[PDB]
Amino acid sequence: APDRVVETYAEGKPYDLFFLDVAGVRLVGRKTEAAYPGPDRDGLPAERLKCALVEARMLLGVVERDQVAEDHVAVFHRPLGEAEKAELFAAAVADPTTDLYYPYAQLGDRVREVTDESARELDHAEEVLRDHVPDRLAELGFRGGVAYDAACSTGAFLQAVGRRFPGTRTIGQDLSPAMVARARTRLDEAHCGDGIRPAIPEASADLVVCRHLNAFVVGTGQAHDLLAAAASRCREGGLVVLLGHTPVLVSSQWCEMSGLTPLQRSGATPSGHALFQCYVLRKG
Amino acid sequence: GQAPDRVVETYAEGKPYDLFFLDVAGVRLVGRKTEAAYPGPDGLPAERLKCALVEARMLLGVVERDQVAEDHVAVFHRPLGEAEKAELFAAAVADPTTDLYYPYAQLGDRVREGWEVTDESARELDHAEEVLRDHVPDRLAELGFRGGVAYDAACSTGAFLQAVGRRFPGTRTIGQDLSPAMVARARTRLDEAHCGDGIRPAIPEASADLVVCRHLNAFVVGTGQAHDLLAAAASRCREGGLVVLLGHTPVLVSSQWCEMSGLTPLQRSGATPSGHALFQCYVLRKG
Ligand SMILES: Nc1ncnc2c1ncn2[C@@H]1O[C@H](CS)[C@@H](O)[C@H]1O
Ligand SMILES: Nc1ncnc2c1ncn2[C@@H]1O[C@H](CS)[C@@H](O)[C@H]1O
How does it assemble (chain B)? Predict the structure, then answer.
């Protein structure tokens, strides 16, 4: 018999309901505090953090049907055992094409600050991801060139990419001038301005990074406009990378309709204990 | 293996309630309801009518993912060929357990926007339910229904419950409807007809052999109201009895919620004898 998971709009968090499309089977989970950056060691337990990471223990069951109503979102599912959760979660870790998405990230009222500690906070929450992406870009054929970060933040991420591919020109852009001030110490080039006004000519970058198309940063319409803005900077055959601390607001299906063929959709921690969103797309 | 497509319905002017899902062969298909060939298929062309009927031509593709946004709902899907739709639609016709539902029926503005019922208006409703009247009584016989007390919580003109009372003679037909103009017409068709909100059922608790609900649907009630009314109507059904959910407009209660409430679905959709059309027809056994 099926079960129902609910997130109300007034005080619930619809953006915490994630879907995992594994092996033609859709699973539903509720994101909680994840073990960050790695799993609990033998004698030292890992710290918890609300971040991009999902783990098997946050899975709920096998999605049968949803019902989006006036004041809440409901997902009907058949519950999964703890061992069944881990095995299906492992199959998603073994397949980076697995989509991890949050279909209700723009529902509810909850979705409706640059300091020295605030820059350190987001840099820490993106660590498990700075460790993953540059190596994974090498395995996907990235050879270097011009790397464009449309919302570079401190610039630590794009700098990590430029370290992995020596000779890559790192060009950052951020809306916050406090962000740009820091990013100029880590990047060859950092511009102050909204991503909707890109600072580089079109089709001039071999890698475009988008970390701002996400819940609590932009709305749905804006995220799709900024996606078309950042991707217009990518040359043909180049790579577009979408990820984020908070749920990405664009689907990989929309990217495919935009001519951005997904090469991978999610990534896992080296231990395999967690999954996160990591869309790597090839512009056609 | 097909690059996706997108079907959109806006809340302000679109019709999200017209997007239907077909859960056939362990996969979800998406379609948009248009005017169906009613009551039967076409060498004379049948009349077209917005009703409970969906046809294979109304399918769009295989659901990949949806995105319920602030001002619209989108469904990403791989489009199906016309021959492919009929093949999958025929497999749904051949399995009345196929769930046909409208998961966005309670979203949008159109579903948010008198004393007299004329003779022609009563004719209008009975005609829209004719395919449904021809099907359920014969289908309820094949599912073990032997008779007793048949309670219709929103009997409307009463013609539907009268059809049931004819397939199973000796059954006491109890009607109820919010509208007093409905009750007056249903009194001429049923053993008794009561005026009142189905949230206050006019029939003893846990005493009916069959409960019919045509009011748990879009444009009739809200979502929370539909669930409260379902609880009230099913509460009149005796253990082991049958509860039937159906509607001219999309049914607002999920089959999964019926199973959570002790109502085991024996079938979820029905098909015209021609097999050309499908419609929602939940038959639930109470435990
Ligand atoms: N529309 C936009 N264009 C460029 N950068 C943006 C942005 N919206 C947010 N950001 C930038 O993205 C970073 C992570 S939230 C943050 O440093 C913010 O300044
Ligand atoms: N809350 C309610 N209780 C009983 N009947 C209701 C109702 N809401 C609508 N109805 C009745 O159901 C029928 C739907 S086509 C219609 O004849 C209306 O009078």
Answer: Monomer.
Total tally of structural domains belonging to chain B: 2
Compute the distance between CA of residue A267 and CA of residue A93 in angstroms, rounded to an integer. Answer: 7
Does the distance separating the beta carbons of B260 and A103 come in below 8 Å? no
Q: Going along chain B, which residue ranges are E strands? A: 5-10, 19-24, 27-32, 36-38, 47-49, 59-68, 72-79, 99-101, 149-152, 172-177, 192-195, 208-213, 237-245, 263-271, 278-286
Pocket-testing residue among A153, A157, A175, A233, ligand 1, by greatest number of atoms within 8 A of Cβ: A175
* PDB resolution in Å: 2.4
Residues 157-186 of A with CB under 8 A from B: none
Give yes or no for residue A176 CB within 6 A of ligand 1.
yes
Measure the CA–CA gap between A42 and A20, rounded to whole angstroms.
29
Domain boundary among B66, B101, B136: B101
Which residue range(s) make up the domain with A170?
A: 116-283
- Which among A66, A101, A136 is the end of a domain? A101
**Domain identity same for A154 and A16:** no
Q: Which residues of B touch A220 (CB under 8 A)?
A: 67, 69-70
